[PDB]
Design an enzyme around this catalytic site. Sequence first.
Site, PDB file in Angstrom:
ATOM      1  N   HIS A 120       7.043  70.804  28.416  1.00  0.00           N
ATOM      2  CA  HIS A 120       5.767  70.268  27.937  1.00  0.00           C
ATOM      3  C   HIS A 120       4.592  71.017  28.577  1.00  0.00           C
ATOM      4  O   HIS A 120       3.668  71.466  27.889  1.00  0.00           O
ATOM      5  CB  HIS A 120       5.706  68.755  28.219  1.00  0.00           C
ATOM      6  CG  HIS A 120       4.394  68.111  27.872  1.00  0.00           C
ATOM      7  ND1 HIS A 120       4.252  67.269  26.790  1.00  0.00           N
ATOM      8  CD2 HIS A 120       3.191  68.161  28.480  1.00  0.00           C
ATOM      9  CE1 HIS A 120       2.994  66.845  26.741  1.00  0.00           C
ATOM     10  NE2 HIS A 120       2.334  67.363  27.757  1.00  0.00           N
ATOM     11  N   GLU A 121       4.600  71.161  29.901  1.00  0.00           N
ATOM     12  CA  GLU A 121       3.469  71.815  30.562  1.00  0.00           C
ATOM     13  C   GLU A 121       3.365  73.285  30.176  1.00  0.00           C
ATOM     14  O   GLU A 121       2.266  73.811  29.977  1.00  0.00           O
ATOM     15  CB  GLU A 121       3.581  71.701  32.083  1.00  0.00           C
ATOM     16  CG  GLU A 121       3.801  70.312  32.618  1.00  0.00           C
ATOM     17  CD  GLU A 121       2.923  69.276  32.017  1.00  0.00           C
ATOM     18  OE1 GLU A 121       1.816  69.606  31.527  1.00  0.00           O
ATOM     19  OE2 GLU A 121       3.363  68.096  31.988  1.00  0.00           O
ATOM     20  N   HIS A 124       1.676  73.718  26.898  1.00  0.00           N
ATOM     21  CA  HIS A 124       0.215  73.717  26.996  1.00  0.00           C
ATOM     22  C   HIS A 124      -0.333  75.110  27.310  1.00  0.00           C
ATOM     23  O   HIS A 124      -1.356  75.524  26.755  1.00  0.00           O
ATOM     24  CB  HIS A 124      -0.282  72.750  28.082  1.00  0.00           C
ATOM     25  CG  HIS A 124      -0.231  71.285  27.725  1.00  0.00           C
ATOM     26  ND1 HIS A 124      -0.727  70.790  26.543  1.00  0.00           N
ATOM     27  CD2 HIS A 124       0.197  70.201  28.425  1.00  0.00           C
ATOM     28  CE1 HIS A 124      -0.580  69.480  26.512  1.00  0.00           C
ATOM     29  NE2 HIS A 124      -0.064  69.087  27.664  1.00  0.00           N
ATOM     30  N   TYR A 156      -1.299  58.190  22.171  1.00  0.00           N
ATOM     31  CA  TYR A 156      -1.485  59.347  23.037  1.00  0.00           C
ATOM     32  C   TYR A 156      -1.123  60.592  22.237  1.00  0.00           C
ATOM     33  O   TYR A 156      -2.000  61.344  21.824  1.00  0.00           O
ATOM     34  CB  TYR A 156      -0.630  59.229  24.295  1.00  0.00           C
ATOM     35  CG  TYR A 156      -0.879  60.337  25.302  1.00  0.00           C
ATOM     36  CD1 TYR A 156      -2.017  60.340  26.082  1.00  0.00           C
ATOM     37  CD2 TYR A 156       0.029  61.374  25.467  1.00  0.00           C
ATOM     38  CE1 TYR A 156      -2.264  61.372  27.010  1.00  0.00           C
ATOM     39  CE2 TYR A 156      -0.190  62.393  26.384  1.00  0.00           C
ATOM     40  CZ  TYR A 156      -1.343  62.380  27.150  1.00  0.00           C
ATOM     41  OH  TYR A 156      -1.553  63.387  28.071  1.00  0.00           O
ATOM     42  N   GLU A 163      -1.437  67.404  22.838  1.00  0.00           N
ATOM     43  CA  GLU A 163      -0.278  66.737  23.420  1.00  0.00           C
ATOM     44  C   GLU A 163       0.869  66.690  22.425  1.00  0.00           C
ATOM     45  O   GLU A 163       2.032  66.876  22.803  1.00  0.00           O
ATOM     46  CB  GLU A 163      -0.641  65.336  23.913  1.00  0.00           C
ATOM     47  CG  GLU A 163      -1.803  65.306  24.963  1.00  0.00           C
ATOM     48  CD  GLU A 163      -1.507  66.070  26.248  1.00  0.00           C
ATOM     49  OE1 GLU A 163      -0.312  66.290  26.600  1.00  0.00           O
ATOM     50  OE2 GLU A 163      -2.489  66.440  26.930  1.00  0.00           O
TER      51      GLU A 163
HETATM   52 ZN   LIG Z   1       0.321  67.177  28.347  1.00  0.00          ZN
END
Ligand SMILES: [Zn+2]
Length: 198
Positions: A120-121, A124, A156, A163
């Site tokens: 996930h990071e 980004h 979210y 995201e």
């Molecule tokens: Zn995130």
Amino acid sequence: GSHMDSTTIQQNKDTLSQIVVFPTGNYDKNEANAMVNRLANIDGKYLNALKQNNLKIKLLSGKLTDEKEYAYLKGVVPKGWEGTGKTWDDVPGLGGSTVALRIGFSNKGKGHDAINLELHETAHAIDHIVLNDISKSAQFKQIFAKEGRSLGNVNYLGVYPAEFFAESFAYYYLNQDTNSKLKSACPQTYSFLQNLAK
Ligand SMILES: [Zn+2]
Ligand code: NI
């Protein structure tokens, strides 16, 4: 197409050896290695682009906000975390212009809601550094309007396209099960990610 995966892993681990930075202090070396192994599933073109941009994936032996570079986040509430009593001091990873990840906190629920922290990071960072904020593009906005709630976390992921991009990317690359779940739940997002990597 299934018979030469060892070569892809070899190449991506070579790339990751020029990206990942291990921390001072003590930590679980086998788990740090496991994180590198999971990152090696990401398409090599993206990993080599991160390397060209001198992005480092900093694995951490402690809390994010105990690193000098992230101390400014002490006490600060992440977007979408209003009302929880929690702050960045409690969050195990961040991604964007940089990437920082606490060793041991990969799995969903280890202080974060992603299917896998490192994917996930890093997604980004790929979004921002490599793909010129593609999560903000008109193309992705249309996909997100349709499919952005279908991985759950509706208030979210369903509200923040960056995201949803990062979580979809993590599903695409984590394992065959998550990849198939994305194809079923979010077919346009799946096709979008497949074509980006072509
Ligand atoms: Zn995130
Ligand atoms: Ni093959």
